[PDB]
Coordinates of C-alpha atoms in Angstrom, one line a residue:
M1 CA 0.0 0.0 0.0
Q2 CA 1.1 3.6 -0.7
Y3 CA 1.2 5.6 2.5
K4 CA 1.4 9.4 2.6
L5 CA 3.1 11.7 5.1
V6 CA 1.9 15.3 5.4
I7 CA 4.5 17.4 7.2
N8 CA 3.4 20.6 8.9
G9 CA 6.8 21.7 10.4
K10 CA 8.0 25.1 11.6
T11 CA 10.4 25.3 8.7
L12 CA 9.8 22.2 6.6
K13 CA 6.3 21.8 5.0
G14 CA 5.0 19.5 2.3
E15 CA 4.2 15.9 1.6
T16 CA 6.1 12.7 0.8
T17 CA 5.2 9.0 0.3
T18 CA 6.4 5.5 1.0
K19 CA 5.3 2.0 0.1
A20 CA 4.9 -0.7 2.8
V21 CA 3.1 -3.9 3.5
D22 CA 1.5 -2.6 6.7
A23 CA 1.0 0.6 8.7
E24 CA 3.5 -0.2 11.4
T25 CA 6.3 -0.6 8.8
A26 CA 5.4 2.7 7.2
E27 CA 5.4 4.4 10.6
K28 CA 8.9 3.3 11.3
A29 CA 10.1 4.6 7.9
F30 CA 8.3 7.9 8.4
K31 CA 9.6 8.3 12.0
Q32 CA 13.1 7.7 10.7
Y33 CA 12.5 10.2 7.9
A34 CA 11.3 12.8 10.4
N35 CA 14.2 12.3 12.7
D36 CA 16.7 12.6 9.8
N37 CA 15.1 15.9 8.9
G38 CA 14.9 17.2 12.4
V39 CA 11.1 17.2 12.8
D40 CA 9.9 16.7 16.3
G41 CA 6.1 16.8 16.4
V42 CA 2.9 15.0 17.3
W43 CA 1.5 12.3 15.0
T44 CA -1.9 11.2 13.7
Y45 CA -2.8 8.4 11.4
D46 CA -6.0 8.1 9.4
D47 CA -6.6 4.6 8.2
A48 CA -9.3 5.7 5.7
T49 CA -6.9 7.8 3.7
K50 CA -3.7 5.9 4.7
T51 CA -2.2 9.3 5.7
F52 CA 0.1 10.2 8.6
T53 CA 0.4 13.8 9.7
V54 CA 3.1 15.3 11.8
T55 CA 2.9 18.8 13.3
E56 CA 5.5 20.8 15.1

């Protein structure tokens, strides 16, 4: 499944995507991505749209 990450950061804003077999695998990839880019926010996940959102 294609999962989407919506980033609403202080300085970095946009969207990116990743492919994974399940949501927990996608979450790990996105949490690594966020850490690598210095984003420290709160997360939500909407199973209906397969979209994660992170806000600083």
